Amino acid sequence: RKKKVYTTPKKIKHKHKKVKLAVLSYYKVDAEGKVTKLRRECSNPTCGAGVFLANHKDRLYCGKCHSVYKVNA
Amino acid sequence: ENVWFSHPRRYGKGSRQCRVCSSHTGLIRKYGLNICRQCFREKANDIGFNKFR
Amino acid sequence: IKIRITLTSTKVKQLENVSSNIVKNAEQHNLVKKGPVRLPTKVLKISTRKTPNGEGSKTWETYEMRIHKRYIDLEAPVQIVKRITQITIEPGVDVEVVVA
Amino acid sequence: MLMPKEDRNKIHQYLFQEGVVVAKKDFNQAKHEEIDTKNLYVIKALQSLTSKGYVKTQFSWQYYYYTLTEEGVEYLREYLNLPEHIVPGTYI
Amino acid sequence: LISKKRKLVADGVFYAELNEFFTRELAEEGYSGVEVRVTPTKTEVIIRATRTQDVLGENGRRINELTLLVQKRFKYAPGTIVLYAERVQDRGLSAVAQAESMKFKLLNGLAIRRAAYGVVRYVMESGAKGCEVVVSGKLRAARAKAMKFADGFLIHSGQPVNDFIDT
RNA sequence: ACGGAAGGGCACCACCAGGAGUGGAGCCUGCGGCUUAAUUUGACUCAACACGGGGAAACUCACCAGGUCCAGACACAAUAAGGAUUGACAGAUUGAGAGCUCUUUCUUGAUUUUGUGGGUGGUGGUGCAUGGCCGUUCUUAGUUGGUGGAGUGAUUUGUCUGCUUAAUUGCGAUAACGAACGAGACCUUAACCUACUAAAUAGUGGUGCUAGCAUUUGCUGGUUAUCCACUUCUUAGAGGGACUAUCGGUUUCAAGCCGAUGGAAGUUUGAGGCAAUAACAGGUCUGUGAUGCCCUUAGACGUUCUGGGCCGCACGCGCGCUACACUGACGGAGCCAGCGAGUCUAACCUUGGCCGAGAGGUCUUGGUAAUCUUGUGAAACUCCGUCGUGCUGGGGAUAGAGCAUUGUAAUUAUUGCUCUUCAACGAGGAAUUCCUAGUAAGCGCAAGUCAUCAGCUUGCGUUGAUUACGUCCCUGCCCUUUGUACACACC
Ligand SMILES: [Mg+2]
Ligand SMILES: [Mg+2]
Ligand SMILES: [Mg+2]
Ligand SMILES: [Mg+2]
Ligand SMILES: [Mg+2]
Ligand SMILES: [Mg+2]
Ligand SMILES: [Mg+2]
Ligand SMILES: [Mg+2]
Ligand SMILES: [Mg+2]
Ligand SMILES: [Mg+2]
Ligand SMILES: [Mg+2]
Ligand SMILES: [Mg+2]
Ligand SMILES: [Mg+2]
Ligand SMILES: [Mg+2]
Ligand SMILES: [Mg+2]
Ligand SMILES: [Mg+2]
Ligand SMILES: [Mg+2]
Ligand SMILES: [Mg+2]
Ligand SMILES: [Mg+2]
Ligand SMILES: [Mg+2]
Ligand SMILES: [Mg+2]
Ligand SMILES: [Mg+2]
Ligand SMILES: [Mg+2]
Ligand SMILES: [Mg+2]
Ligand SMILES: [Mg+2]
Ligand SMILES: [Mg+2]
Ligand SMILES: [Mg+2]
Ligand SMILES: [Mg+2]
Ligand SMILES: [Mg+2]
Ligand SMILES: [Zn+2]
Ligand SMILES: [Zn+2]
C-alpha cells in the first residue's frame, strides 16, 4: 500500500438533509373563519385526506402512496 | 436498496460456507455436514468419526 | 398385523442388548418371531489431508465410522406392541416400529 | 441504526415473554425466524442493549444466542409500560 | 424423511454444537461434558457439571432459558426437549473439568508453576493413574516456549489411549 | 556434533541383479521470468513447484477501474417537535430503473445528524511475538526418572562384553534395586470354519402354474401372495482357529531357522491406526468469533455492486497425460469386478417406453436404500474379420464449420456431439526416480472436490513379470572406540 491517488474528482457531495424551511403544511388563510385546502388530495382511499400531492412541473407526486399517483388536471 | 445483495450465490463456492467458521476453502459437503477440513478435524471425535485404519 | 422392528445404532455391544432383549420378550411370551438379521456395516468414509496448510509431506489419513443395522419381524396383537415399543431404549440407539 | 419503533418494540415484546432470543449471523435475509422483522434489526438492537449493561451475548457457531439479564427486564418493564410483576421471561 | 446415513451424521452434529454451547456458556460452572438421550416424543440432554445448583440457578431460572434457548434454534416443539443437570462424578478424573480450572487461575495472576502443580497433585489423590499438564506460549519473555508438568505414568501409544486417556 | 576416522549392523524414500520408467515429442497443469492497471498470495533441496483439499466465468476473491452503504455499540456535548432526521416518482448524470449526486416539491418524525472519547471490522503486517495443528530431525529404536556406587564437578550409571532379533527384542558375569515411556501388546482390516447362533431387504433344492428342445425318466428358463424345507456360497454377533506345532543339524551345545512334514493361514501371517524424550527460531496470523502488538477505521485496508484479472507470453524448470505400431491399429462378436454414492419440505440417483446420427430431449416408474439405479455387464481383454511395414488404417497436436447441455451470463472456444484439417514423435544424452507376490508393472471404476469441467488425489478391483535375500560400493540410517583448535556445532 503506497497511497490512494483518487484520480476521480473531489466527489464528496453528500446530499441535503431535507433542508429546513419555515413552518409548513399550509392549507390557506382567511378571516372569520373559513379555511380550505389546496394541493388537491390523492384519490386513493389509502391516504386519509392528509397527504400533499407534490406537483413539480406538469405532474403531481404522492408521498404516502409512495409514487403511484399520476394525473394532470 | 436493490443493489446491496442482488447478485446470486445460489450455486458455486459462494453458496456454501462452513457451518462452524463461515469459511469457503477446504469444505466437506458429503452427507450434508458442511464443515471445513480444519473444523471437521477437531470435532472428528465428537461427530462420531475415528481413525480405525 | 406384521409389525417390524429396526435398530440402527453405531455401537454393536450396546445394540446387541436391545435386539437380545426384544427377541427374549416374545420368546417368553410364546409368539412366533423372525430372528434378528444384521445388515452389513455400511461405512461412511472421510479422507482429508492432515495439515491445515498446504506444505510438508502429503499425508492422507482417513477417519472412518461404522453403522450397524438390525431388523426383527414380529406378529403381536395391539395390546402388547404398545408396551414393547416404549421399552428397550438405549442412548445412541434408534428404533422405528412399522405395522404391516 | 435508525429503524421504525414498530420494529424496535416488536423484538422488545417478543424478548419479554420468551426471555431469550436467537438470530443467525446471516446478514441480509430480511426475515428473522419467528419475527417478521429484519435480521439486521434483531442483531443491532440487542447489540445496543448489551452495551448498556442490559443483555449478555454469545456467538455459538454464528448463531447469536441472545439472553436477558436482571437489569434488562426492569428496563424492559418501564419501556413497555407493563404492570409490575406481570410475567417473567423464564417463569415455570 | 432422511436417509439413515445422514441421520447419524447429523446426530453427531447435534452433539458437537451442543458441546460447544455448553462449554462457552457454562464455562465457570465446572462443565465437564454432555450426552444426549433420545426417547420417542421426548428428548433428553444431560449436562454433567460440578456446580449444578449454579447451572440451574435459583428456582431453576438459569436452566429454564437454556432449555428454551436450545428449544428455539434447533426447531423443537414445546415439551420435546428438556435439560437435566447432574453433578459429575470423580471431579478430579476429568481432563475437561481440570481444563477451565487451570484457565481462570491463570487469568487471576496465579503463577504458572504453582497453578500447574496444584492441578496435577489434586488429580493424583482423586484416583487417577497419571496426569499431564502442558503450558505453551510466551513465558517470562517474548521467545515462546513449552513447559511440561506430570506425575505418575501415562501410556503414550496403543488402543488404551482411546479407552483410558481423557484429553 | 563432526571426521574424504575405525568397528559392528541396517535401508529398494541406497546400491547391486534387474522391471517399469522420467529427461527426448505434443498437450494439461504448478513455479520462475517477462508482461500488464492488476496479472492477488504463501511455500525454495530432501523437509517448495496437480501443494494451500488452489480442477478461479459471476460468487469464492484476497489484485485492478469505478459505484454504493455503514453494521461509528455506547457515554457526554451540540442542532432541535417554529421541527433532529429518513426515503422518493420524472429528466439530467451514471455500466447501471445506485435520486448515488443534481431541478423540483412531497414524505416519516426523536430511532436519528454533528463533535469529542470509545468501539467495531479487516483473506492488512508481523509464522521472528503467539496458541492449536501439520511436516522434519528419525519408520529408525530410542528416551527418562527414583534410590543407590566413582569424582573437585559438568558428568557417569543403569541404558552391554556379547550371541543374535527388525527392535536397550530376548537373554548369562558384574557395583546397582527396580520402574516409566517407546517397540511390542492393543484396535481396524484381509483371507478358514460345510461346527454355534437367522434371513423372500440374500439365496438354494422341491412341489404348484407356465415357456422352449424332445417327447422316455432329462436339460435350459419364468412366475409373487403357489407354498414346503435348508443356510455351502452372501451378510453378520459371540466364538473356534496359529502358538512358529512335529522331527535331524548349529552354537559355556544355553533358542530359532534351515531340511521336511501339517495346515486356509509359518517374511511379528499381510497391510494400516496409534506411535517416546528433545528440538526446528520448519510451515501456518488466507479455517476460525484462537490471539498480543502494529496499521486502518466513513471518497475506510470494513461491506457490497458492475466489468476485468488470477489463464495473460520471447523463454528456463517441476508433478504428469497421449504416444512413436502387427506383443499392433481399427470393425463386428463373447464378455467378467470390488470399494462406495444417492432427493423433503428438497428437487438427488433415475430403470423402462418414445424421439434423435450423436450429444441430448421427452412421459411415466423405483428408491431415504442388501429390495432401485447396480451383476455398477469397467477396461486392459478372448473369437472372427480388414490392414500390412509405408510417418501408413501409427499419432491425433494445431486449426475451420455446425448442433446441444450446465450456468442470470461462456467472447481469450465451460464441457459433449459431427465433419474436415493432420504437426512433432521413427524408443529419446548426460542425468535421474520408484520397486521384492498377488508385490512391481499394466488396466479401468467409485468417491472428494461438482450448477458445468479431470489430464489431480484418495480408494477399489483386473491381468500379472524379471531379479536378490545380498552387501557396505554410493547415498543415507543406528550403536561402540578414537581425534577434535568445532557449540547458531563442517554450510
Ligand atoms: Mg539397478
Ligand atoms: Mg512418459
Ligand atoms: Mg526424510
Ligand atoms: Mg486439483
Ligand atoms: Mg475453471
Ligand atoms: Mg472474479
Ligand atoms: Mg467482485
Ligand atoms: Mg516458523
Ligand atoms: Mg507454531
Ligand atoms: Mg548418585
Ligand atoms: Mg562424592
Ligand atoms: Mg542416579
Ligand atoms: Mg414355476
Ligand atoms: Mg525344534
Ligand atoms: Mg503390523
Ligand atoms: Mg492458524
Ligand atoms: Mg475487503
Ligand atoms: Mg497460480
Ligand atoms: Mg508431489
Ligand atoms: Mg478389439
Ligand atoms: Mg459387484
Ligand atoms: Mg488414430
Ligand atoms: Mg534413487
Ligand atoms: Mg467423481
Ligand atoms: Mg530386502
Ligand atoms: Mg591428532
Ligand atoms: Mg591430540
Ligand atoms: Mg569456538
Ligand atoms: Mg571442510
Ligand atoms: Zn395512499
Ligand atoms: Zn470451519
Provide DSSP, E58-89: GGGHHHHHHHHHHHHHTT--TTSEEEEEEEPS
| Residue B15, all three cell numbers | 453458496
Quote the DSSP letter at residue D82.
P
* Resolution of the solved structure (Å): 2.5
The C-alpha atoms of residue E124 and residue E154 are separated, in whole angstroms, by: 13
Taking each helix axis as running N to C, give the angle between helix C12-29 and helix C78-85, from 0 to 180 degrees, rounded to the nearest 10: 160
Say whether D55 sits in a helix, a strand or coil: strand
Give, in order, the Cα–Cα distances in Å from E98 to each of A43, E18, E28.
74, 20, 12
C99 CB-near residues (< 8 Å, 6+ apart): C1, C2, C3, C81
Chain B residues 10-39 with Cβ under 7 Å of strand F are: 10-16, 18, 21-32, 36-39
CB distance from C52 to chain B under 8 Å?
Answer: yes
Question: Are the C-beta atoms of residues C96 and C9 closer than 8 Å to each other?
Answer: no
CB distance from C61 to chain B under 8 Å?
Answer: yes
Question: Are the C-beta atoms of residues C8 and E8 closer than 8 Å to each other?
Answer: yes
Q: How many CA atoms lie within 13 A of E103 on its CB side?
A: 13
The C-alpha atoms of residue E142 and residue B27 are separated, in whole angstroms, by: 35
φ and ψ at residue E72, rounded to 5 degrees? -85, -45
Compute CA D23 distance to the chain's CA centroid, rounded to the nearest angstrom. 10
Q: How far is the CA of B36 from the centre of ligand 17 (A)?
A: 22
Q: Is the CB of A55 under 7 A from strand F?
A: yes
Question: Are the C-beta atoms of residues B32 and E1 closer than 8 Å to each other?
Answer: no
Round to a whole number and report the distance in Å from the CA of C55 to the C1' of F317. 20
The C-alpha atoms of residue E69 and residue D67 are separated, in whole angstroms, by: 8
| Residue E103, all three cell numbers | 484457565
Question: Are the C-beta atoms of residues E90 and E129 closer than 8 Å to each other?
Answer: no
Place of cell 415439551: E79
CATH second-level architecture of E4-84?
2-Layer Sandwich (3.30)
Provide the residue range defining the domain that includes C81: 1-100
| Residue C12, all three cell numbers | 454393536
Q: Is the CB of C21 under 7 A from strand F?
A: no
Q: Is the CB of D52 under 7 A from strand F?
A: yes
Give the angle subtended at the CA of E134 by the CAs of C50 and E32, to the nearest 5°. Answer: 85
Taking each helix axis as running N to C, give the angle between helix D5-18 and helix D70-80, from 0 to 180 degrees, rounded to the nearest 10: 130
Say whether C95 sits in a helix, a strand or coil: strand
**Number of structural domains found in chain C:** 1
Q: Where are the beta strands (DSSP E) in A1-73?
A: 54-55, 60-61
Q: How far is the CA of E81 from the centre of ligand 16 (A)?
A: 37
The C-alpha atoms of residue E40 and residue A5 are separated, in whole angstroms, by: 67
Task: Give domain limits for chain B.
Answer: 1-53
The C-alpha atoms of residue A46 and residue D45 are separated, in whole angstroms, by: 31
